[PDB]
Amino acid sequence: SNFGVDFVIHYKVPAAERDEAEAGFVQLIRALTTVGLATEVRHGENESLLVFVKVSPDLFAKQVYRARLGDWLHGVRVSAPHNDIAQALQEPVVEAERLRLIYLMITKPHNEGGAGVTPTNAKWKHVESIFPLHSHSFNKEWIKKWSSKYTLEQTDIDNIRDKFGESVAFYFAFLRSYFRFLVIPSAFGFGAWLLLGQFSYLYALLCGLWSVVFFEYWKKQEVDLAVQWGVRGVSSIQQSRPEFEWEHEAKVYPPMKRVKTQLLQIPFALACVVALGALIVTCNSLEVFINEVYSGPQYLGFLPTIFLVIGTPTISGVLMGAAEKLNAMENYATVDAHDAALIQKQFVLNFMTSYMALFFTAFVYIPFGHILHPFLNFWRINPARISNQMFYFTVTPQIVNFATEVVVEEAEFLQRVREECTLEEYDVSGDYREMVMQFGYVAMFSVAWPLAACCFLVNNWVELRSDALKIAISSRRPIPWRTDSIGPWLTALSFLSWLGSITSSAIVYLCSNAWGLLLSILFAEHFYLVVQLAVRFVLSKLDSPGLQKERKERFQTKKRLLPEEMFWQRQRGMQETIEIGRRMIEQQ
Amino acid sequence: SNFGVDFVIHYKVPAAERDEAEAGFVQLIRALTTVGLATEVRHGENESLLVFVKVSPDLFAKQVYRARLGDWLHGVRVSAPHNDIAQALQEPVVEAERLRLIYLMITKPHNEGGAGVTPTNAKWKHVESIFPLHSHSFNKEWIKKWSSKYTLEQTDIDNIRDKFGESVAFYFAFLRSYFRFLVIPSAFGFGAWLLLGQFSYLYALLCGLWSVVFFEYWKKQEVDLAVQWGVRGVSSIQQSRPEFEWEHEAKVYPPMKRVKTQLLQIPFALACVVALGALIVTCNSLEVFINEVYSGPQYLGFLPTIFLVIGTPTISGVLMGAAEKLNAMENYATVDAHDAALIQKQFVLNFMTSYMALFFTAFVYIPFGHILHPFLNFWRINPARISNQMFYFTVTPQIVNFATEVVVEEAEFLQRVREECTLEEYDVSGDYREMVMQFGYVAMFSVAWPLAACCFLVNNWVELRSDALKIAISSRRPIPWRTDSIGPWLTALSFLSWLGSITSSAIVYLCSNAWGLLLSILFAEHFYLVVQLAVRFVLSKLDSPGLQKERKERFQTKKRLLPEEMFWQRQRGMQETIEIGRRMIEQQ
Structure with a gap:
């Protein structure tokens, strides 16, 4: 079915405004390659240039580690994120979160781990849509x-x-x-x-x-x-x-x-x-x-x-x-x-x-x-x-x-x-x-x-x-x-x-x-x-199963996170204390 | 005013049932001393024996450290509890929490850091009340x-x-x-x-x-x-x-x-x-x-x-x-x-x-x-x-x-x-x-x-x-x-x-x-x-000040917690990618 393609970019280039269209294409290519994404270019119907993008497992592992750190920060992930960028995913890498993180990598602003190629706001006025591909074998x-x-x-x-x-x-x-x-x-x-x-x-x-x-x-x-x-x-x-x-x-x-x-x-x-x-x-x-x-x-x-x-x-x-x-x-x-x-x-x-x-x-x-x-x-x-x-x-x-x-x-x-x-x-x-x-x-x-x-x-x-x-x-x-x-x-x-x-x-x-x-x-x-x-x-x-799971997680974390001087110098110990108490009740 | 007394126990002893009253008194004394509390015994009106109890700053510091760990566990204390049992209180030791922790030490069951002397449930049928003393200088x-x-x-x-x-x-x-x-x-x-x-x-x-x-x-x-x-x-x-x-x-x-x-x-x-x-x-x-x-x-x-x-x-x-x-x-x-x-x-x-x-x-x-x-x-x-x-x-x-x-x-x-x-x-x-x-x-x-x-x-x-x-x-x-x-x-x-x-x-x-x-x-x-x-x-x-404080704490924590192979081997780099893209739009 799919050839490992993880995302597709349309990038319509009309007959007019071609001179800046080429500049936009090259800028998109450098922006996508800086993040560390493998790219390919193919034809599309009506003067469009389809760009196929995938991820270098080390970069993706680092990005998913950062995403899990961010999830832990906001409280949506109570358990510890992971040990390090090492193989801690044995936490699956299921296609939904992988595609979401790749889309974030593609579309996030340059300030925080990405290269903003949003098709509406910035100078990316030629890209039409950024979408993943359907799995026909799974779909049927x-x-x-x-x-x-x-x-x-x-x-x-x-x-x-x-x-x-x-x-x-x-x-x-x-x-x-x-x-x-x-x-x-x-x-x-x-x-x-x-x-x-x-x-x-x-x-x-x-x-x-x-x-x-x-x-x-x-x-x-x-x-x-x-x-x-x-x-x-x-x-x-x-x-x-x-x-x-x-x-x-x-x-x-x-x-x-x-x-x-x-x-x-x-x-x-x-x-x-x-x-x-x-x-x-x-x-x-x-x-x-x-x-x-x-x-x-x-x-x-x-x-x-x-x-x-x-x-x-x-x-x-x-x-x-x-x-x-x-x-x-x-x-x-x-x-x-x-x-x-x-x-x-x-x-x-x-x-x-x-x-x-x-x-x-x-x-x-x-x-x-x-x-x-x-x-x-x-x-x-x-x-x-x-x-x-x-x-x-x-x-x-x-x-x-x-x-x-x-x-x-x-x-x-x-x-x-x-x-x-x-x-x-x-x-x-x-x-x-x-x-x-x-x-x-x-x-x-x-x-x-x-x-x-x-x-x-x-x-x-x-x-x-x-x-x-x-x-x-x-x-x-x-x-x-x-x-x-x-x-x-x-x-x-x-x-x-x-x-x-x-x-x-x-x-x-x-x-x-x-x-x-x-x-x-x-x-x-x-x-x-x-x-x-x-x-x-x-x-x-x-009682809800989610509450029981949260309580079990909290218990596991707990298992893992585990004058005055003369007045007070009369009976300084314990033996004298109950001795004086015995004589003390004996007085009455 | 007060002589450093932190809690008072009544412990009524009637004229009758005196034989087990003495045993209860001695048992109370050993239970209080095991926790590490200094005790004194004095008269009281109508056959009562008032027991004056204070804390050994090291034991109190350890107990307040444990209490802060417990507070951190349940989420009521988002910030880190403390470094260790060392002087991390420079987190005040204000009288309210000190008295509450001493009362917990007095009344908690023996299973978890205490010696249960509750005046109603257990064999402590002779103790009438456990109360702190009033501060007349503060009260007036x-x-x-x-x-x-x-x-x-x-x-x-x-x-x-x-x-x-x-x-x-x-x-x-x-x-x-x-x-x-x-x-x-x-x-x-x-x-x-x-x-x-x-x-x-x-x-x-x-x-x-x-x-x-x-x-x-x-x-x-x-x-x-x-x-x-x-x-x-x-x-x-x-x-x-x-x-x-x-x-x-x-x-x-x-x-x-x-x-x-x-x-x-x-x-x-x-x-x-x-x-x-x-x-x-x-x-x-x-x-x-x-x-x-x-x-x-x-x-x-x-x-x-x-x-x-x-x-x-x-x-x-x-x-x-x-x-x-x-x-x-x-x-x-x-x-x-x-x-x-x-x-x-x-x-x-x-x-x-x-x-x-x-x-x-x-x-x-x-x-x-x-x-x-x-x-x-x-x-x-x-x-x-x-x-x-x-x-x-x-x-x-x-x-x-x-x-x-x-x-x-x-x-x-x-x-x-x-x-x-x-x-x-x-x-x-x-x-x-x-x-x-x-x-x-x-x-x-x-x-x-x-x-x-x-x-x-x-x-x-x-x-x-x-x-x-x-x-x-x-x-x-x-x-x-x-x-x-x-x-x-x-x-x-x-x-x-x-x-x-x-x-x-x-x-x-x-x-x-x-x-x-x-x-x-x-x-x-x-x-x-x-x-x-x-x-x-x-x-x-x-906007509430508590929400701003919580957001500032979260930001501080973040600052502290910081086939397919043949298809994909055509343009393996970036230079060939935009070269083929230029010729690619040149074809139309």
Whole structure:
């Protein structure tokens, strides 16, 4: 398969600006060779020069020793790093960390062990992408093995860690845990739909309890995996963004300027929410118009919603592009803060685009449906319709995806690399966002359509292999990054859960018929809070394997790290002391 | 003053059981001398034999070195412990830690550096108390200096730390911070009482915001003080209780037995709540009876409440004694868990005894006052009365305390020690509980009587010296214990704050006149939650001196701890690489 190539650099050279392009190429070559990297140059499609780079095991051993020293410094590696640059790796050299360290060597600034060739900030305006190569032998075996199973063991996630790093492995572990936890809502939602009719209050409590239990158990599993993979606490390592444009040095950026460009979110968010509300109001007005005076064969009534969801991927993509443009123009020093801000913006936009139609149907039309008269007479109150609407939503994605699916020398290695270079980087945040949106649907609107949980369970089982296929075939190999958790998405999940405990409950009051609505909302929220406290208390006192491992390591370290003068001169010893004590009690 | 005496042991010997009393005395002497402690024996009042104990600086240096090694092991001391048993203390040997280590030497089990002489568990059934001696020269100076000031600097709290250890210093720092923070509620409560009439909703929001801001800022100050005093993270050091009665060893106790004896709280709590509710209902029925058909001069109407509060210290003391008896009979291994359980029981009982009368007046009588007819016709609806009632409560304590106040050789050293031995150990949990009760009053019922905050501010200023006088004169010197926070009391405070944000708001709706009440309660609770989130976010991004110190220590530590073969053999160097690259772009 691969010829030992460890990284690939694109370095587009156009027909124009060739004179400085050659200088950039030679400078890149000296910068790469100074670090101690073996390099090769080959053709690429459309005037590109692919550069193949590997490591001299002594230099790599020294670099991994320095990296382990740095990890020990920040507390993410409690055990001793190693003896010396000698053979102490008999601590494996697994491909994920090797590729991450080689990428750091390639892209780190010249100040600290590297030669910065970042393709956006510095004069490296000609390099397009720096990516590792895919292992087809491993990829085909992984795809075949995952498709031949029904449940994935922890060893599969460990192999994903070993090959693609911490972020991809964490996403796959989260998806596996969420899919396994989706069985309970599927089972009891099928039970409620079979027996309890529709809009079951007990179903709302069960869904909220499942949501909080799953959230807390996933936090416990997250810390377990973080201490198992040796990446616990890596979030404290704040790495600077190369594209950070600073002003002075004491690098620093005026916080007031960042606040000023952050305030641009409010007009952007307001414009997006107003446009989306207008679109959804028009769509639902047309829906009630066709459901009022028209003929079907029934199913055609909710067709505007079907069209809205079929068109919503494009609107969501445009909004995500705008959010990314806004995030790029608003400077962030660390990459963690930039990623958190981008995740927050994308989560808000997707929250709007995916839930505002249901929110308008439930808490706007149902309580007072007499506000649609202007639109209704421009073209010219069912309580259960939301259920049907929710059903369409909860099936729209899966069904349309299915529809799409139905519609449908060393020259070979060089051609494979050239084909791979045209692919796009794998963005795990998109998959995280789609899973978070599905969880929000489950915790928010499953009361209307209790069967939604089974459909999402089937979709999750399909996605556990669909995303694997996307990574293996449809995407170039991502850079192995280290993270101790799924990031800020946890917060989003928590938020959804909390507000879910409101919305679903309110639905049960609104679609089954004021002071009663407020009582139901407050009782559901307080039940959610008390079960959150109870589950946190239960899991806190529960013994985790990571805690036992940490305690064993601490015990091993402990095993390895192991007047006044006249008053006091009366009875200077011990014999006189108890002699005088015996006579002393003898006096009484 | 003192003759170098560092600890005192009582060791009561009755007229009976003298034969084994002498054996216990001699065994205590050998156990104390084996550790390496100089001992003296003198008379005491009522057949007691006072034993005076000090340390041989080499043994004490070795013990403090071992203690610092243990502190380094658990992470509470990040810096290196010391070079060796040599003179590395030039790390002071301040009296608090010296006394704590000597007490550990006296009371630790023989397994790990000590000779267990605990006065309750083992055969040491004759020793009554082991306590250090008071420093009258320091005590009088401290009392005079604190009474001559208006505000206490951080240096006074540092001196309290140096003399009486972490717990007393933490309590005094908490009381100082709470008294300083009480200025804002006093000021704006006086403003509301002067201008906004009574039962001001804006006052409820201001009080809730102050409560959450004070709670979060006190958490920040707590971590600051914990890292300043070098006791950050000492809560993880779980020390076993000597009075723990175990069954097997693998020490272990059956958790089911502990759960069985813990279930006895439910009948105890129910009986206490029923009796207290009956007493308060009878008192308020008599109150409305005299306010209905009787003659005063007005002020005599609330006399039953005055009598109830004057009598409530005795009932509270009986309940605390019962709770302590229940806690003792229900085994706990660590002292932290035992203290937390005792604090929880005492907090629940005092919560009942101090708030249930106001709760019945506000949320029971006011909404429906037609349930008191049975009592009313046994003896035989004002909205603002609660305010008056609250006023009486908020002044009852201070006023009655004031009333009480108004009503009102080396033989000298031996007599001083004998007089001191008759005193009682200082229980900081009682002062913590009274401060927590006052804070609960402020956050809960200040809407009825906005002037309560000023009275509590004056009472806090008085108490900051009254508790100092109680410790200095009216109590024997407490053993210096280490704690990184005020303990579980924080949780109690948080709880009060949350429910305060309900109760006060409900009062504003109930005493100013349903769905509106529920709307007000939910809006107030959500406002409390959002301001909690905002304050947590603001303080999280704020820079603390402790974080800077930890980062500087980490930086100092870092400064101190500092086929494939044919494919890859084409251009083995750098010169050929850019030569072939130049010709390579020359080909196109």
